[PDB]
């Protein structure tokens, strides 16, 4: 329904063993389309989805350098943060940056964001108003002031509102067969026995897109969410996704309980019971 | 495509 262009950057200091690992990737919704790995052969931002190959080297070179500069920021940041936290030259450490836009069904701006983090913890982030800064440490307040004085929020807001959304829409038209398509779930049940008076019920759901989905078990209307087990959404590799939700029951009395599907690939929801 | 603005050394 709504859509998003998202860019995930990862940066890992490996002291002794040289320059830090740096991996930029780029998603439209849940489809990956650009990548950069510092340990790649190319040293070029590559295409990871056919519909961005259309764009000539003009696009690519400009993206390559842009990403090279992102890495060059983190390169220093690692240096600075080791500074700020008084940590050792011996230790490896991680920065993740993450920015992107969100556009509704009508394809117009709703949310932008710029989350940043050192070693897994939140460090600084651009707040939902695209104007203020939030930051979990006094260390990060030093960065927050730095970023206030510089007026990053200005530059960054005009990207997130502006540059991001017009580029999001350029991609949603290029690969509309890839991206705008909705593949529908393909559900079933694998029922197996744990004991003589007991049995399992997995409500599967394969080959679907996008990864948004909600499967809950209902004992003929009763919201069963204690005995259930719900694994996180696998990517199939395919391009489609997978998911199941398990539950154990007083078995024998099998053909009683309901699996509630929820997806925009399937116009109105579903319910299933044992054959 | 990527940002080319609004990005700074911490």
């Amino acid at each position, epitope marked *: 329904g709504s859509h998003s262009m998202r860019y995930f950057f990862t940066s890992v200091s490996r002291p002794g063993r040289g320059e830090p690992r740096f991996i930029a990737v780029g998603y439209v919704d849940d489809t990956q389309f650009v990548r950069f790995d510092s340990d790649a052969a190319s040293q070029r931002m590559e295409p990871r989805a056919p519909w961005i190959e259309q764009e000539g080297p*003009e*696009y690519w070179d*400009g993206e390559t*350098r*842009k990403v*090279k*500069a992102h890495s*060059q*920021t983190h*390169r*220093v940041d690692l240096g600075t943060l080791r500074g700020y936290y008084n940590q050792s030259e011996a230790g490896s450490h991680t920065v993740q940056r993450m920015y992107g836009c969100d556009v509704g069904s009508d394809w117009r701006f709703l949310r932008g964001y710029h989350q940043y983090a050192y070693d897994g913890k939140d460090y600084i982030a651009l707040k939902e108003d695209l104007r203020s800064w939030t930051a979990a440490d006094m260390a990060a307040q030093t960065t927050k002031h730095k970023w206030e004085a*510089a007026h*990053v929020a*200005e*530059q960054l*807001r*005009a*990207y997130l*509102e*502006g*540059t991001c959304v*017009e580029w999001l829409r350029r991609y949603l038209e290029n690969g509309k067969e890839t991206l705008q398509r909705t593949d529908a779930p393909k559900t079933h049940m694998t029922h197996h026995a744990v004991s003589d008076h007991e049995a399992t019920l997995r409500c599967w759901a394969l080959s679907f897109y996008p990864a948004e989905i909600t499967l809950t078990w209902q004992r003929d209307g009763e919201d069963q969410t204690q005995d259930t087990e719900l694994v996180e959404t696998r990517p199939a590799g395919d391009g489609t996704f997978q998911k199941w939700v398990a539950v154990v029951v007083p078995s024998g009395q099998e053909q009683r309980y309901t699996c509630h599907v929820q997806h925009e690939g399937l116009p109105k929801p579903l319910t299933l019971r044992w054959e | *495509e990527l*940002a*080319g*603005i*609004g*990005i*700074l*050394t911490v």
Partner: T-cell receptor
Amino acid sequence: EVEQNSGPLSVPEGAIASLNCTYSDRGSQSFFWYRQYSGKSPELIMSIYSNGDKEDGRFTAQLNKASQYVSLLIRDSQPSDSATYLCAVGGGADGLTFGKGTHLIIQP
Amino acid sequence: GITQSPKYLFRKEGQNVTLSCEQNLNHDAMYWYRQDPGQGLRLIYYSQIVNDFQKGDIAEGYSVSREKKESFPLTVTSAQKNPTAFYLCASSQGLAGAGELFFGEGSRLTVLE
């Protein structure tokens, strides 16, 4: 690459003066107007990152990424505003290409 | 501020010369341009981060170091058959081309035959 309307251009004291500029790269994300007096070092007067107008009292710039249009116009123009005005474009981690320039000379 | 020195200079072919340019704003980006009469300012080099620098299109016959983040010295070598120009140092806080570009105060190099 960054083609700038060019004269030189004359405008009397108080008259409004406008300067356009256009750029041939969609990757452009940041847009600037610098001013340069002869034998002296360019200084920023206007910077703009998204579409529409930005104003600082007597100067007012405007941008249309779609048309690839970046503008400046000077209100109330003083002689202080003589000598060369510079369109510059960035946002691609490649530095900054400055246009040809436009020498705008104001009549006192 | 940014200071480039010296305001003027000239050295005879066979010898190099260097235009030292320092800044204390703690900007990551630094740049050198040469402005010729008629033309605009062409980019010689820019330098995104310490120990690193990148070509423009008129770098043939120019050296730049970035040993420290403070200074971006531009050596005009026994360079090309036409270095006579106006040279401008500049810093900017952030990515190269993203921000204000705080300029030095120019340099007027000439050949001596």
